[PDB]
Design a protein around this ligand. Structure first.
Ligand SMILES: CCCCS(=O)(=O)N(C)c1c(N)n(Cc2ccccc2)c(=O)[nH]c1=O
Ligand SMILES: CCCCS(=O)(=O)N(C)c1c(N)n(Cc2ccccc2)c(=O)[nH]c1=O
Ligand SMILES: CCCCS(=O)(=O)N(C)c1c(N)n(Cc2ccccc2)c(=O)[nH]c1=O
Ligand SMILES: CCCCS(=O)(=O)N(C)c1c(N)n(Cc2ccccc2)c(=O)[nH]c1=O
Ligand SMILES: [Cl-]
Ligand SMILES: [Cl-]
Ligand SMILES: [Cl-]
Ligand SMILES: [Cl-]
Lengths: 292, 293, 292, 293
């Protein structure tokens, strides 16, 4: 069945001003590409093609100019705005008619993932046609996120949002898969102590016992881009991987062509406008080179 | 006699595409603040308050949104567009009416400077009220820049642009001081074989007239640019190591304007409030009570 | 059956002098621990307990003081020297009587690995009781390594050592698994144009059609520490992972305790001498915390 | 009148264990060269040629292997051990016969300095032939250091060691100049509550006598230390960005000795050969033909 994807690329507030005064976080580069390329590549990796990008009233035309209607990468892109940063769950209100009758999946515009068999870890998430699937990852600072609590035997029992006293060190990453049940669950939500919390959306699935909570192991890197210090670290992290390997991370053109969403000829047409820099040359090398 | 400044912050073309497809280079951060804060701070260190910012038609409003007219920082900022990226020396045809009969200074919107007595090094560039004054810095890769050539005694004898076999390793920094002759030198230049009004031709004109002062910017200075993705990241790591070590900032324009006495403590306090939550407003607040030597 | 491990921690020559004038590369720290901890942790991860450390005549007592007889981490450590840097295959001459009759495995002292299911990728290597198993990894600069060549259909056909003209971009990592056949193959080896080449040891297995060449995917990081620039990159790479996660990479004490090679009580005894710094505090946290 | 120098490069204890279980801190690299090259270079910048190096009994031979007696670099190096790590001011009881009736200078073997006119800033510290001279640098974390306190006019009025509530953000750098009184001040000190002969007591003695010169090391200077794993890595990224930008090196002792004229071109050429293969020997070779300002 049909599964659609949202990228919530909204306002980081004033938290990183003045770095973000001119233009929103998710259009900043992480090393060699816009930050958005990374969650865009995430959805593409779970095999999602029809995608809704949400952002500030101001930055939406810029995400638009950046991406187009997607048709160039064998994707289908539709855009929507969020008036005020009133919580991540608000993505499910804004995208209701986009979501329609289908299965959905929400990724944060400022979250990076990297690792082996990542395709498969998402592939097994996208496959469950019922309930919701989220990921837990061990971190040093669990307070900054939705913390998940497991019982003596591996089962999820509590989910607290930014708790002052973490129970475990297990944070909920910014990737989520939901069934047809999500939108309605989101309509019945009340503001928190003042946002529509993604964690309530998840605990509503936990109480109905339909939150599947799979561990994303220490062999995976989950980076968020929350501080100037960490945004820097993620640029160094990508830079080291890409220069070591001669291969890119979250290059969508490559992700499309590999999922066979565009033929060798279309990819080449995408290589043309960027032939002079290394980014194009990279796409061009993808026509002749075998990469396992 | 007063000096005006020009920041060139136009189109870097397609070189750093796709990072720069959505916004222009000079809005990307270097650590905790927009890249343009760094050359804007450089002009301020030179005591210059009237600055023209030249960018693309497409990005000009985003610069306006970030920097305004300068009144917040005791400056006056004007804006101009460069529709076609036809080379650096063109900032002088676009900036003509801005410049008038005044002295000027050009800065690249994508160069950072750091180090000791940087202020005094700019003051003596700014005090020479006739001719041009540029700066020479030893680099690894002078192939990429305007290269200077010195005789046995340290007089500059030639300037070449991007030679394959540079005569020295001394590159011309993206900082230039000019008298009133610069506009007329720029109006008379013919397009490079490329079709770019090259600033090295402008400086070369002044050199032929014995009016080019070339001062050495020591290896004790950091002159970084951000010409590649790797070097942008390198420049971010650099500032963060200085700021995290020191609890002082590099190229905080509120602090510098305060330190020039272009704004007072009351105005600084007002500038801090809408940012009191983050480290930056907290940093502007702390400047009010602390003596920093 | 019994499988033993070598760590070849010998001379990098004069390549990184003066940084390495005082003491050999593999005792330099990568971020928070000696470089050797990393290949040591690699062998431990393929379930290897009996290990031979080879190094310069000069640095052997220092590797010794660093590690002891291993008995503290439930390992069994024996030491051996290499007079001159006359090739990596020389490890199989020096360690003959150590190797004895058993299965073996050689890792380079200056190679870092990181990734998900790394235990398993080694577990499937250590398991094949016949022939040799090596890994290929895509890289930008294949010239610096043994390059492997694959045919139109995924099979390894040539192995060239530092070729001037790489065929593929696939380099041989510094992890190798060999059967009882290795030692003898190494005795019959002649010096190259002037070293005993590890690649000849491997091509000898390729000609007998007994080199198993498994792709280590782009989801894995293989770092070597060959330039001052790269040694730096690997320190930043570890630092980012460890500070993000609150978990260490290649902490042997943790690898032992998890493989149950030491009981909660012994680990605690190891936590004592380092209680004041973060490294001990980390071991101490391992007694009470559940890490999936 | 001549000045001797002392580098303290002893046991950092167990703090950076396990990185430092096999070798002492001051042998670890900062980028492309051993950490001790950096303070050794600092002494050389001060014009000091006779250096005592104080390390553990265990590591002393490895320093000897790396640095020798100095003759290669126009210096004379001697060695001494500190069996027990009893604090910095103890370098003066151990170094007594080395010091004699001469002036001295202490440097921490784990501090880096960079920036413009660093040489001249050391010269004026070295020219004051009476009293002590230290340096104050604004930091984020003065809790960790000896903190200076200034009155309204910039005279130093107190010194505190690791206060929980520092009076300023000005920390005392690990660089100190002393006259002949320092040994006698050190012999009379009583163990800190910890049991460490604290250098801040030594400097405090001189302050009480109106003989402490405290000079500001500007924010245009980088004074980095390597007190944590993260900051060691940060200091490596820092040097590499300067050296990779410039094609010049920071704290290359062959270059500095050559530049002081402590060795000549023939001697430099000899020092380059056993390293002609790597970038370092290539860098020593290139110093023979290039003019660097
Ligand atoms: C979007 C974050 C995860 C990217 S990743 O799967 O770990 N990764 C390194 C990666 C991978 N693995 N691949 C290979 C791949 C291509 C298509 C489907 C699955 C895997 C890419 O073409 N681009 C990539 O960035
Ligand atoms: C970005 C322009 C060069 C920066 S700098 O002169 O080296 N520097 C560290 C600096 C300094 N020195 N100062 C202090 C200062 C401010 C105004 C006039 C002289 C000195 C600042 O307020 N901000 C600064 O960024
Ligand atoms: C030795 C390089 C590979 C280390 S790793 O397997 O990727 N890794 C991150 C790691 C892992 N995965 N683990 C968990 C683990 C412990 C024991 C057996 C398998 C896996 C650790 O205890 N320490 C580690 O460093
Ligand atoms: C590590 C001591 C401080 C280094 S420094 O004075 O800022 N500096 C960059 C430096 C400089 N300036 N020089 C040039 C120089 C050498 C000798 C005397 C004056 C200047 C060097 O040869 N090596 C150096 O590391
Ligand atoms: Cl894992
Ligand atoms: Cl200088
Ligand atoms: Cl993979
Ligand atoms: Cl300064």
């Amino acid at each position: 069945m049909k599964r659609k994807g949202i990228i919530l690329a909204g306002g980081s507030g004033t938290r990183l001003h003045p770095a973000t005064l001119a233009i929103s976080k998710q259009l900043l580069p992480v090393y060699d590409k816009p930050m958005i390329y990374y969650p865009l590549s995430t959805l593409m990796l779970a095999g999602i093609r029809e995608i809704l990008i949400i952002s500030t009233p101001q930055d939406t035309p810029r995400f638009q100019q950046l991406l187009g209607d997607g048709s160039n990468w064998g994707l289908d892109l539709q855009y929507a705005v969020q008036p005020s940063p009133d919580g991540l769950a608000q993505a499910f209100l804004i995208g209701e008619s986009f979501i329609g009758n289908d299965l959905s999946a929400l990724v944060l515009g400022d979250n990076l993932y990297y690792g082996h068999d990542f395709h498969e870890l998402l592939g097994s998430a996208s496959q469950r046609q019922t309930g919701a699937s989220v990921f837990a990852y061990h971190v040093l600072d669990p307070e900054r996120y939705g913390v998940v609590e497991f019982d003596q035997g591996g089962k999820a029992i509590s989910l607290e949002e930014k708790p002052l006293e973490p129970k475990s060190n297990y944070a909920v990453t910014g990737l989520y898969f939901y069934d047809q049940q999500v939108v309605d669950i989101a309509r019945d939500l009340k503001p928190s102590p003042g946002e529509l919390e993604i964690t309530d959306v998840n605990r509503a699935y936990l109480e109905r016992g339909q939150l599947s909570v799979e561990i994303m192991g220490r062999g995976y890197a989950w980076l968020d881009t929350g501080t100037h210090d960490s945004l820097l670290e993620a640029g160094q992290f990508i830079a080291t991987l890409e220069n070591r390997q001669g291969l890119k991370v979250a290059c969508p053109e490559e992700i499309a062509y590999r999922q066979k969403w565009i033929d060798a000829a279309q990819l080449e047409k995408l290589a043309a406008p960027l032939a002079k820099n290394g980014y194009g040359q990279y796409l061009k090398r993808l026509l002749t080179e075998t990469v396992y």
